[PDB]
């Protein structure tokens, strides 16, 4: 499951979290198994304008 979020919102991609994108964008179950992967993409997903 691939998406792009902010830098402070990476703590919300986790089981048992309270948060904003956890509730209204992307929810993980309490019995979730797997790995969450995050890396900075300021060189690709950003524009000066």
């Amino acid at each position: 499951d691939s998406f792009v979020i902010r830098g402070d919102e990476v703590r919300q991609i986790a089981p048992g979290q309270t948060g904003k994108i956890a509730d209204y964008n992307y929810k993980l179950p309490d019995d979730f198994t797997g790995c969450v992967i995050a890396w900075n993409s300021n060189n690709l997903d950003s524009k000066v304008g």
Partner: protein
Amino acid sequence: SALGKLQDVVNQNAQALNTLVKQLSSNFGAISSVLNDILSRLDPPEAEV
């Protein structure tokens, strides 16, 4: 004290029941001894604990 042998058995059984009822008032290290308080205060990841 003529009938002390029967009264001893009755008192032991009633005291065991009273101890078993009294043990519900202990939280055993949890935040509360009432299940409804935990279920109304906490999210299921920590209410599970």
